[PDB]
């Protein structure tokens, strides 16, 4: 079981960036995928989530309207499209799977498997 | 969601961390989950649904609802328990998952 | 278990027969060769002596023995190879007994050959013997296989990558 | 064995003659079968056909 | 079959994202969606047992289906074909009918669970609440978050609110 | 299983020849039988789907069952007989048990449909009609043909006849 | 499934040793346990019919499974093994799943029987009895052994005790 | 090729008896209701009688109740209508119509989709 | 059939153990009952045991002194008699309960009876 995040790096303020999340060792089409960021010195902040088939998407108020979450089950990858980035978005972005039971998957599944994370820097 | 900024415990002692809402009550319907993080490693799930321990978690980590506030109890704290502990609460009125501020535990 | 072992050593056995039978159909590189597990016996010094060679199974496992009988296209080839014109091949065992008589017939050219070689096989139980007696048209065994069957399986006809 | 009984093994004659049976009880690895060594052609077919006789 | 999922409760709740069955409450302190953890967990356990029973009950030994026969052996080719075709037909029919019937059974199970939850909450609130249909119950007495949690848990104190309800009835 | 077909409703109606379930009303303008088109049509669709699932799910390929073996091939004939007998036994057992279980389930389905119809009519007319027991309700108000048609359709107006029923209750 | 065996009646009665379903009464003349003969007998008949349908529907013909083949005939042995193993797999799967589903349906049958008996007693005592939960009814009138027997049989006399119940209610 | 064929009509005296036969082909006869309708020479249609699939249930109009009896023979794929005490008003053309029956249910109100060519019955001196 | 054995003469205050053996029927699918009949008096039900032996019932007269047990492997039911009195001199029968294939109850009729065993308590 493994989640690896890609993308990220230096982005000018107001730019765009796409973060990938490839899962291996487990069936990717049977769990929720969550995105959490940790600012350099501050706590964790939940950002977005996506259903198994991608029908249901949830976002936090801080990034509602700017961030779009997508999923590609065939390629075993989940995406986080970042738009209109500000300097306050500089954080390490983790991806978290939800512990899903065999018969049901819910939005409140615990985030058991995380990733090493990718550092996103928004500066001029 | 408010957590205590920092608290300390002695070796072999018992400490009880606290997670609470600003203007409400923490119940089992909020599904409190606790995470342990050592900077800058990824967060590690400790307790979910207030009483469930994932495989590999030491048995000394227990949770419960201690009123209007969620509680995580460590019985016999070891040297490797010195980390930052976060609490995820589920709110249904805006449909969101809210992380806590974080508490730094210092094992003395 | 599998074990390819020489049932009849080429050098030791067949002292009165020529063991250099080679055909252009079984061509390795550009030269003409033959099967690696069978031996083509042709008469030596203008005559084909009677042969009687036997093997005893002491491997505590079943032994797969393969051989063949040569069928020349015309009487001239049979006379020029085995000297007789009515040869006989006999293979005997405690549970396998069969007598072969060469058949001289003209068949369509397959791999530039008109005659045919019919291939036969048998399984020898532990502590069993097999006797080969012939005066012509024998493709004598050279390497036998000692095996032990494991459950049931089959052959997959495919060209997929193997990993 | 069935071979010894149907061939009339000299040391296997104590069996009482019967006119019909429903099945055959046999021992694993019988001692007295074909006293003279040889091969019994179509043995399993004979055992199958002799299993029940009216 | 029990007339709850598509009966007197017309549609589902897309806002309850944490349980199969649950509650929607509204008082002065606010409104929200919550799920009955006990009923949802029991249903999850039952369905998991059902799926594992259907899946893990199939124990298959090592075997090879392919077989090769020459042109002088056609009765065996056809006998092998008959065996394979008969097994395929039996397994296909059984699998299709099994899935078809247990789909009904699972849907009826969910319907029964919802109906039982509704009956339990009706039994707790004998006449202190008025039925409006739609699975909803209007209270004749002021009801706070503690009382809602009491109804959800199963520890509603009927004698405590009987006088006020009778006055407002 | 739901106590409707042989429960609080003892027998059926021979004068209701237009459906499986329905109503019998009696008022000043007259009395007669009727059928609930919605429930009857839903039941018909379900039963048709079940019957077609039983029938059309059996797809058979071309095959010949008879084989011929000479008197020196007896193990062959015994193996063929074993195959045929096993398939026949499996199919007989499966068919018989399947028919029995669906015969249970169809009657249970009809019980559920009748009980759900009774419960729907019960919910509409609350204290505006008393329960005379064996499947009938006695209106506390004058019920004309339009009101009866409203009850059958599902658009009964309780507030309209609330006061008149209260005066007579 | 019907919320009676583990629903509003949490536990069974160890002292009612004469049937599956029954009554417990307490009046001035005494208290005791009795069983409903009709419901118990119908349940026994149904379960006996189900068990006999499962058992006696398996009609098997005289056959011998064993077959012996020599060393030069393995396609024969492998085909025989395939046939036997396939039959064993089919029968094991079918028997196990049949037992599971039939156990579920039997438990649902018992739940339905208890629920129907409770509903019958509820319908008999319209408002002369108060429901305490736990499946139990408190009478608003004195209920001697004759009245309890009438309730048990199904011949309760509502108008006889209606006035006394109204006075005490 | 579903079709119905009526037979057994002709000229009869008043007070006589006459039997009509309706034979159906191309469909399962034992799975549909069978109805009888007559049309007077210049007037509208008039439903007469109906019989169930098994013949257990039989229905009649008020005008021919007690005189007309309708039977059914599922083995021979035929349905009968025995008319007795014929009168001059019975001079009409008699049709046979079958009800559109679902696979799982047959009812008295099934629509009359398949009709027959009809037969002529004349009652006169 | 049922056959009882293990009786005879016992001094008052002694101990006795009766045993009934059933043949021709499944012994684990029926209840087993013990009755006694005094020389000049009527029948008196004593004890009963369930099919698996979990449930055990007694009469008030012999409650606390008699213990009834089962051994389904040996197809035998036991009745142990302790602190025997002179009033316990009777013929002891064993009666099986007519049980349905699907249900066994304490009120199953006693359709099969054994010949009986005579027990004498005297000095």
Rounded Cα distance, G96 and A7, in Å: 52
User: What are the DSSP calls for G20-76, one per residue?
Assistant: SSEEEEEETTEEEEEE-HHHHHHHHHHHHHHHHHHHHT-------------TT-HHH
Rounded Cα distance, H78 and H74, in Å: 6
Contact G61 F86 (CB under 8 A): no
CA separation, residue E134 to residues B55, E148, E149, G117, I112 (Å): 43, 18, 21, 28, 61
Contact F48 H109 (CB under 8 A): no
Cross-chain CB nearest to E32 (options B28, B31, B93): B93
Euclidean distance between the first and final Cα of chain G, in Å?
Answer: 34
Pairing state of beta strands C129-134 and C89-93?
A: antiparallel
> Using alpha carbons only, what angle is made at residue H26 by residues H22 and H28, rounded to the nearest 5 degrees?
75
Query: What residues of E are in contact with residue G94 (Cβ under 8 Å)?
Result: 94
In this complex, does chain B touch chain E, defined as having at least 3 beta-carbon pairs under 8 Å apart? yes
Closest residue, chain G, to C153 (C-alpha): G78
- For residue G13, the tally of other CB atoms under 10 A from its CB is 13
The continuous run of DSSP H or E covering E33 comes out as strand E30-35
> Using alpha carbons only, what angle is made at residue G116 by residues G114 and G120, rounded to the nearest 5 degrees?
120
Say if CB I98 and CB I37 are below 8 A apart. Answer: no
Cα torsion G17, G18, G22, G27 to 10°: value is: -80
Rounded Cα distance, A86 and A120, in Å: 11
Contact D44 G69 (CB under 8 A): yes
Local structure of residue G124 (DSSP, 8 states): H
Chains sharing 3 or more CB pairs under 8 A with chain D: C, F, G
Contacts of C154 (CB under 8 A, 6+ apart): E64, E65, E66, E67
The method of structure determination was cryo-EM
Does the CB of A104 have a partner CB in chain E at under 8 Å?
yes
- For residue G88, the tally of other CB atoms under 10 A from its CB is 11
- Six-digit token string for F25: 């009303």
Rounded Cα distance, E71 and A86, in Å: 78
Does the CB of G67 have a partner CB in chain D at under 8 Å?
yes
Question: 17-76 in F: which are within 8 Å (CB) of E?
Answer: 53-54, 57-61, 63-65, 67-69, 76
Widest distance between CA atoms in chain G? 97
φ/ψ region of B70 (left if φ > 0, alpha if ψ in -120 to 50, else beta) reads beta
Closest residue, chain F, to E86 (C-alpha): F87
Burial bucket for residue B94 (CB in 10 Å: 0-12, 13-18, 19+): exposed
Give me the helices (H) in chain C, please: 75-82
Instruction: Map residue H72 onto helix, strand or coil.
Output: strand
Say if CB G2 and CB G115 are below 8 A apart. Answer: yes
Q: Which of E6, E7, E77, E82 best tests the F interface by mutation, with the highest count of F CBs <10 A?
A: E82
Closest residue, chain E, to F46 (C-alpha): E104
Rounded Cα distance, G158 and G142, in Å: 13
Say if CB G168 and CB G141 are below 8 A apart. Answer: yes
- Six-digit token string for H120: 């002529």
Pairing state of beta strands I90-97 and I66-71?
A: unpaired
Rounded Cα distance, B98 and B88, in Å: 5
Query: What residues of G are in contact with residue E108 (Cβ under 8 Å)?
Result: 1
- For residue I94, the tally of other CB atoms under 10 A from its CB is 25
Say if CB A44 and CB A37 are below 8 A apart. Answer: yes
Say if CB F140 and CB F169 are below 8 A apart. Answer: yes
- Six-digit token string for F112: 């559920």
Cross-chain CB nearest to E3 (options F59, F69, F116): F116
Say if CB B6 and CB B56 are below 8 A apart. Answer: no
Say if CB F40 and CB F146 are below 8 A apart. Answer: no
Say if CB E49 and CB E106 are below 8 A apart. Answer: no
The continuous run of DSSP H or E covering F85 comes out as helix F74-124
Rounded Cα distance, G35 and G12, in Å: 13
Contacts of C116 (CB under 8 A, 6+ apart): C71, C107
> Using alpha carbons only, what angle is made at residue F138 by residues F136 and F143, rounded to the nearest 5 degrees?
115
Say if CB H53 and CB H110 are below 8 A apart. Answer: no
Q: Is the peptide bond before E126 cis (omega within 30 degrees of 0)?
A: no
φ/ψ region of H34 (left if φ > 0, alpha if ψ in -120 to 50, else beta) reads beta
The continuous run of DSSP H or E covering E37 comes out as helix E37-56
- Six-digit token string for G95: 């028997």
φ/ψ region of F30 (left if φ > 0, alpha if ψ in -120 to 50, else beta) reads left
Does the CB of D22 have a partner CB in chain G at under 8 Å?
no
User: What are the DSSP calls for B43-90, one per residue?
Assistant: PEEEEBTTTB--TT--TTEEEEE-SSEEEEEEES--GGG-SEEEEEEE
Pairing state of beta strands B2-3 and B14-20?
A: antiparallel
Rounded Cα distance, I7 and I114, in Å: 14
Query: What residues of F are in contact with residue H57 (Cβ under 8 Å)?
Result: 17
Instruction: Map residue F165 onto helix, strand or coil.
Output: helix
Rounded Cα distance, B32 and F109, in Å: 43
Rounded Cα distance, A114 and B36, in Å: 12
CA separation, residue C78 to residues C34, C114, F117 (Å): 19, 13, 98
Pairing state of beta strands H11-12 and H119-123?
A: parallel
In this complex, does chain B touch chain D, defined as having at least 3 beta-carbon pairs under 8 Å apart? no
Q: Which of A109, A111, A119 best tests the B interface by mutation, with the highest count of B CBs <10 A?
A: A111
- For residue B93, the tally of other CB atoms under 10 A from its CB is 11
Cross-chain CB nearest to G3 (options E60, E98, E116): E116
Query: What residues of G are in contact with residue I105 (Cβ under 8 Å)?
Result: 17-19
**Cα–chain center distance at G119:** 16
Query: What residues of G are in contact with residue C123 (Cβ under 8 Å)?
Result: 71
Contacts of C41 (CB under 8 A, 6+ apart): C14, C17, C18, C19, C21, C51, C138, C139, C140
Residue with tokens 């009729």: I109
Pairing state of beta strands I117-121 and I90-97?
A: antiparallel
Phi, psi of E167 (to 5 degrees): -60, -45
Phi, psi of G36 (to 5 degrees): -75, 115
Query: What residues of H are in contact with residue F17 (Cβ under 8 Å)?
Result: 57, 107-109
Query: What residues of G are in contact with residue C95 (Cβ under 8 Å)?
Result: 71
Does the CB of C150 have a partner CB in chain G at under 8 Å?
no
The continuous run of DSSP H or E covering E153 comes out as helix E145-153
Contact F17 H108 (CB under 8 A): yes
Contact E66 C155 (CB under 8 A): yes
Local structure of residue I86 (DSSP, 8 states): G
Contacts of C35 (CB under 8 A, 6+ apart): C26, C139
CA separation, residue A65 to residues A13, A14, A59, E17, H94 (Å): 17, 14, 9, 21, 76
Contact E87 G92 (CB under 8 A): no
Pairing state of beta strands H3-7 and H17-25?
A: antiparallel
Say if CB E53 and CB G100 are below 8 A apart. Answer: yes
- For residue A31, the tally of other CB atoms under 10 A from its CB is 20
Does the CB of G61 have a partner CB in chain D at under 8 Å?
no
Does the CB of A55 have a partner CB in chain E at under 8 Å?
no
In this complex, does chain A touch chain D, defined as having at least 3 beta-carbon pairs under 8 Å apart? no
């Amino acid at each position: 079981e493994k989640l690896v995040e890609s993308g990220g790096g230096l982005v000018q303020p107001g730019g765009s960036l796409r973060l990938s999340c490839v899962g291996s060792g487990f069936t990717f089409s049977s769990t929720y995928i969550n995105w959490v960021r940790q600012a350099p010195g501050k706590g964790l902040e939940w950002l977005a989530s996506i259903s198994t088939s991608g029908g249901s998407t949830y976002y936090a108020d801080s990034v509602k309207g700017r961030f779009t979450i997508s999923r590609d089950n065939s390629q075993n990858t989940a995406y986080l499209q970042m738009n209109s980035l500000r300097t306050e978005d500089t954080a390490r972005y983790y991806s978290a799977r939800g512990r899903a039971a065999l018969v049901a998957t819910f939005f409140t599944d615990p985030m058991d498997l995380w990733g090493p994370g990718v550092e996103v820097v928004v500066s001029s | 969601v408010i957590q205590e900024p920092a608290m300390s415990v002695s070796l072999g002692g018992t400490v009880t961390l606290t997670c609470a809402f600003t203007s409400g009550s923490v119940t089992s319907s909020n599904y409190p989950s606790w995470f342990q993080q050592t900077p800058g490693q990824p967060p590690r799930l400790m307790i979910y649904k207030t009483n469930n321990r994932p495989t590999g978690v030491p048995s000394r980590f227990s949770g419960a609802i201690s009123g209007n506030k969620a509680a995580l109890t460590i019985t016999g704290a070891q040297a490797n328990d010195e980390a930052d502990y976060f609490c995820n609460l589920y709110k249904s009125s805006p449909i969101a998952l809210i992380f806590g501020g974080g508490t730094h535990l210092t094992v003395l | 278990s599998f074990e390819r072992f020489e049932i009849f050593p080429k050098e030791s056995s067949w002292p009165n027969h020529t063991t250099t039978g080679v055909s252009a159909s079984c061509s390795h590189n550009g030269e003409s060769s033959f099967y690696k597990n069978l031996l083509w016996l042709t008469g030596k010094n203008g005559l084909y002596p009677n042969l009687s060679k036997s093997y005893a199974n002491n491997k505590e496992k079943e032994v797969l023995v393969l051989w063949g009988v040569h069928h020349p296209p015309n009487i001239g080839d049979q006379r020029a190879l085995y000297h007789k014109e009515n040869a006989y091949v006999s293979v005997v065992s405690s549970h396998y007994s069969r007598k072969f008589t060469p058949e001289i017939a003209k068949r369509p050219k397959v791999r530039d050959q008109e005659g045919r070689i019919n291939y036969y096989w048998t399984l020898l139980e532990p502590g069993d013997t097999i006797i080969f007696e012939a005066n012509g048209n024998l493709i004598a065994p050279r390497y036998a296989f000692a095996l032990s069957r494991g459950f049931g399986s089959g052959i997959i006809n495919s060209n997929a990558p193997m990993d | 064995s069935v071979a010894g009984w149907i061939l009339g093994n000299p040391e296997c004659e104590l069996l009482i003659s019967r006119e019909s049976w429903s099945y055959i009880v046999e021992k694993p690895n019988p001692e007295n079968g074909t006293c003279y060594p040889g091969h019994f052609a179509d043995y399993e077919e004979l055992r199958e056909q002799l299993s029940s006789v009216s | 079959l029990f007339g709850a999922i598509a009966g007197f409760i017309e549609g589902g709740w897309t806002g309850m994202v944490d349980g199969w069955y649950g509650y929607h409450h509204q008082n002065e302190q606010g409104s929200g969606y919550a799920a009955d953890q006990k009923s949802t967990q029991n249903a999850i356990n039952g369905i998991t047992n059902k799926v594992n029973s259907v899946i893990e009950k199939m124990n298959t030994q090592f075997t090879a289906v392919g077989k090769e026969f020459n042109k002088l052996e056609r009765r065996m080719e056809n006998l092998n074909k008959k065996v394979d075709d008969g097994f395929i037909d039996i397994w296909t029919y059984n699998a299709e009918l099994l899935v078809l019937l247990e789909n009904e059974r699972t849907l009826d199970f969910h319907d029964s669970n919802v109906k039982n939850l509704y009956e339990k909450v009706k039994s707790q609130l004998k006449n202190n609440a008025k039925e409006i249909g739609n699975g909803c119950f209007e209270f004749y007495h002021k009801c706070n978050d503690e009382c809602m949690e009491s109804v959800k848990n199963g520890t509603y104190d009927y004698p405590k609110y009987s006088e006020e309800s009778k006055l407002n009835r």
